[PDB]
Ligand binder design. Structure first.
Ligand SMILES: [Mg+2]
Length: 319
RNA sequence: AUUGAAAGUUGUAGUAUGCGGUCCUUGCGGCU
């Protein structure tokens, strides 16, 4: 597995799906980067390097597989079963009622990010709570710009716009290369355009598997699956897929989640927006009670568009 | 082949208008 590290020179824009044309709708608000955007940046580099075989021009997916992405300062969205109570974010474990897994009422969820070490303790079921100071928020930087007339140096009519950028220190991407020679091509490049407004990020590439993908969790009936990237597909099909890949049937499951992630994007091949897809948002947790004990995998890919970085679930246990 | 491409928060704008360092005060006492 190859590990790509993107270091933004300054700011990044991963624009939400909304009109953003000069002289009209003029507000661009960034979201947390979707893995397909990172995949697109890599595919575009290969598209220009002449490796159009691995790109998948006009195709939904490339030949290579983007395992997933993570932002860094490496941090992850607070699991949705972690609820803020006073100055602490408390882990809420599944309960049972009428023979069904439920999450007991303990307050509303508040968004935020935690370090990889805090997530690791969570996945091992050893995390009780997190002090509110260790819960990170992503910094935004709002910039307001204009367009000037060529000669008179005054603002052209209606040419004012606003961008809410993200201030991100690092983005990590992991790629499985079936022999396209991506590691060599990425090594030849120092930087690439990532997201909107022609912002660039420095590129480093190392041949390594992150330790979080190599954890030994043991065997249990009570496994959980933390989605680190958006996961596309019906919950039923995802659970069924999970049953097949682990060769074990499920007694019951509970999806703790939030607002669905709206995913469209821009088709650079056809020069028009991509079709809207809906996904289980990062930070969502699928609690599963298998009928038999399973060896909980450190990570597992689920749902549609796996090669674009979607459906990266991190294994964990609960009691 | 990335909700992507493209867009100078710029142009005009005097820290200025009014305002007394003035009022009260014996170079004197006779001492060292
Ligand atoms: Mg632009």
């Amino acid at each position: 597995m190859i590990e790509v590290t993107f270091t933004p020179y300054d700011v990044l824009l991963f624009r939400e799906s909304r009109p953003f044309d000069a002289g009209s709708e003029s507000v661009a608000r960034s979201i947390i980067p979707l893995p397909q955007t990172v995949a697109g940046a890599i595919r575009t580099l290969l598209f220009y390097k002449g490796l159009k075989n691995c790109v998948g021009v006009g195709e939904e997916e490339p030949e290579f597989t983007l395992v997933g992405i993570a932002i860094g300062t490496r941090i992850y969205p607070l699991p949705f079963n972690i609820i803020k109570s006073e100055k602490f974010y408390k882990v809420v474990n599944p309960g049972r009622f009428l023979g069904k897994l439920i999450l007991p009422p303990k307050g509303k969820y508040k968004s935020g990010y935690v370090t990889e070490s805090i997530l690791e303790k969570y996945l091992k079921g050893e995390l009780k709570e997190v002090e509110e100071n260790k819960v990170i928020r992503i910094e935004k930087e709002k910039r307001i710009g204009i367009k000037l007339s060529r000669e008179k140096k005054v603002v052209e009519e209606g040419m004012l716009y606003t961008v809410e950028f993200l201030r991100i220190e690092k983005i990590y991407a992991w790629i499985e290369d079936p022999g396209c020679g991506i590691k060599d091509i990425l090594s030849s490049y120092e930087f690439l355009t990532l997201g909107g407004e022609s912002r660039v990020a420095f590129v480093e590439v190392d041949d390594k598997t992150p330790d979080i993908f190599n954890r030994e969790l043991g065997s249990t009936k009570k496994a959980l699956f933390y989605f680190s990237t958006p996961t596309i597909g019906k919950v039923g099909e995802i659970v069924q897929e999970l049953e097949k890949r682990l060769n074990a049937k499920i007694d019951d499951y509970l999806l703790v989640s939030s607002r669905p992630t709206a995913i469209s994007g821009w088709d650079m091949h056809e020069k028009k927006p991509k079709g809207t897809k809906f996904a289980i948002p990062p930070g969502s947790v699928l609690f599963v009670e298998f009928k038999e004990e399973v060896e909980v995998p450190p990570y597992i890919k689920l749902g549609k568009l796996k090669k674009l970085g979607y459906g990266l679930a991190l294994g964990g246990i609960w009691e």
